[PDB]
Amino acid sequence: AEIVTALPVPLAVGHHQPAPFYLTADMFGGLPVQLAGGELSKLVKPVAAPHVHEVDELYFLVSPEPGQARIEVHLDGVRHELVSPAVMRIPAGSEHCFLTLEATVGSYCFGILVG
Amino acid sequence: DAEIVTALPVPLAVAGHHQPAPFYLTADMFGGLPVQLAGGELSKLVGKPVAAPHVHEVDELYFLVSPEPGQARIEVHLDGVRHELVSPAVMRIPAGSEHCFLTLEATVGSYCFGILVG
Ligand SMILES: C[C@H](c1c[nH]c2ccccc12)[C@H](N)C(=O)O
Ligand SMILES: O=[P-]([O-])[O-]
Ligand SMILES: [Fe+3]
Ligand SMILES: [Fe+3]
Structure with a gap:
């Protein structure tokens, strides 16, 4: 049985700290996605830095109950306010970041990253 | 301009599942995705399996996560063998393998x- 428990894996990615990855491209002989992120309640953090990826990135925002988490996604000079649950596509090459406005524990x- | 999906989750029928499963990524989104992603919060599912054992023809990953490590635990049945996963954990279910999970423990936010990996 293939079980990975040494998680998250910190990987450096404009971002101050290594991002915490739960799926990496090399797991299980190869994955078509990578997945990073974490809980937002301790992230509610005055600044965020813009950055670009060479692949598309999807933001997936979720909370135990709908509406309990809220972020601002900055995408190429446009501010977008999203409420959980939400999924937003960041096209490869686009400068982007997000800020957490509100989040309950468990958001x-x-x-x-889509290969 | 920006592609945003908020009509979520998308209920989709999955083999063996009593009710439609809540999907947040589907294969047709954004012109095509190499994965589908379904699931949800476990705090009300302790003791209550969402599905009978079932098989997919694609690989499936279980991704178990909680705000603090250890706050969530599930039991994965994999071709008649039980495996206990403790958050955070990722488990690969090879295509063709009979499987399901039972929630053993979950806090709010687990x-x-x-x-599903194409
Ligand atoms: C991987 C980055 C990320 C997304 N969600 C997060 C939650 C906590 C810490 C990092 C992240 C992403 N590249 C971004 O654009 O911020
Ligand atoms: O019900 P989901 O974990 O496939
Ligand atoms: Fe990013
Ligand atoms: Fe399954």
């Missing part, structure tokens, strides 16, 4:  | 996501 934003 |  997550995952960044999913 | 999730199990099933990721």
Whole structure:
């Protein structure tokens, strides 16, 4: 049985700290996605830095009950306010970041890099 | 301009599942995705399996996560063998393998996501 428990894996990605990855491209002989992120309640953090990926990134915002988490996604000079649950596509090459406005314990934003 | 999906989750029928499963990523989104992602918060599912044992023809990953490590625990049945996963954990279910999970323990904010890998 293939079980990975040494998680998250910190990987450096404009981002101050290594991002915490729960799926990496090399797991299980190869995955078509990578998945990073974490709980938002301790992330509610005055600044966020813009950055670009060479692949598409999907933001996946979720909370135990709908509406309990809220983020601002900055995408190429446009501010977008999203309420959980939400999924937003960041096209490869686009400068982007997000800020957590509100989040209950158990709210997550995952960044999913699509190969 | 920006592609945003908020009509979520998308209920989709999955083999063996009593009710439609809540999907947050589907294969047709954004012109095509190599994965589908379904699942949700486990705090009300302790003791209550969402599905009978079932088989997919694609690989499925269980992604178990909680705000603090250890706050969520599920039992995965994999071709008649029980495996206990403690958050955070990722488990690969090879295509063709009979499987299901039972929630053993979950705080508010514990999730199990099933990721179908094309
Ligand atoms: C991986 C980055 C991320 C998304 N959600 C997160 C939650 C906590 C810590 C990092 C993240 C992503 N590339 C971004 O654009 O921020
Ligand atoms: O019900 P989901 O974990 O596939
Ligand atoms: Fe990013
Ligand atoms: Fe399954």
